[PDB]
Amino acid sequence: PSLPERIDTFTELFNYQLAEKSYDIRVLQSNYPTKLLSPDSMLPQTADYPLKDIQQLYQLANTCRPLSPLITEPLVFTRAICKGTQLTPRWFSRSGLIHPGGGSYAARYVDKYPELQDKLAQYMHIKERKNVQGDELLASLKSMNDDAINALIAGASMFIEQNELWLRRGDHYFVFPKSVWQENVANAGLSFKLASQTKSCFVKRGNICWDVE
């Protein structure tokens, strides 16, 4: 019984009608563009532009007083802020979402116009958003460390989120507590460490490095 065979056995020992939570990946995809989930989005994107471009961008942002086509959309946004031009939710929805300095256009816009928070929150990076009562998915996403959220972005078959197992079945993730998954690990004859806990990760699924028990 190979390791990938034991992993298949492991996934078949769960009762998916008994998961504590489940999320439709297609609904997740509709509500959360990848750019609003990726940890990299919150870091400066400025390396993806020739210096002469960003030179135009911060001169414009800092003084409100450029040629490259690649900088068109950041220019439109910067000019809009400088001038008081209204940017609608549809504008944000059709934009690249992420500002060259890191973070979202929408979070910067709401900084200038705080009353727009609720209308524009869906165009902000999850790391910029506040949790909302009853929005369990947004809470689940915000609490994921980088390895976990990156496994989810990749559509990984499984990953560990703190002490809970997220298990993909079809187009859904089903979430199980340690009481359930640690038994199924043992019953499949497996053991694992997280990718952040070991250097040797020969059989990897999401952030899980599998081995025999």
Beta carbons of 209 and 192 less than 8 angstroms apart: yes
How many structural domains are present in the chain? 2
22 domain-assigned: yes
Is 129 among the domain residues?
no
Residue 58 structure tokens: 């911060």
Q: Which residues contact 49 (CB under 8 A, 6 or more apart)?
A: 57, 68, 70, 71, 100
3-state secondary structure 129-171: CCCCCCCHHHHHHHCCCHHHHHHHHCCCCEEEECCEEEEEECC
Same domain assignment for residues 170 and 199? yes
Answer whether residue 158 is part of any domain.
yes
Q: Kindly state whether residues 43 and 108 are assigned to the same domain.
A: yes
Picking from 104, 124, 144, the residue at the C-terminal end of a domain is 124
Domain of residue 97 covers: 38-124
Distance CA 88, CA 95 (A): 11
Q: Which of 124, 151, 172 is the last residue of a domain?
A: 124
Same domain, 52 and 11: no
Cα angle vertex 32, ends 54, 20, to 5°?
Answer: 145
- Domain match, 24 and 88 both: no
**What long-range pairs does 116-119 form, CB within 8 A, spacing at least 24?**
119/89
The verdict on 54 and 90 lying in the same domain is yes
Resolution of this model in Å is: 1.9
> Contact at 8 Å (CB) between 107 and 119?
no
- DSSP letters spanning 26-38: HHHHHH--GGGT-
Cα 170 to Cα 16, 22, 26, 31: the distances in Å are 11, 12, 11, 19
Assess whether 163 and 211 both reside in one domain: yes
- My answer on whether 89 and 162 are in the same domain is no
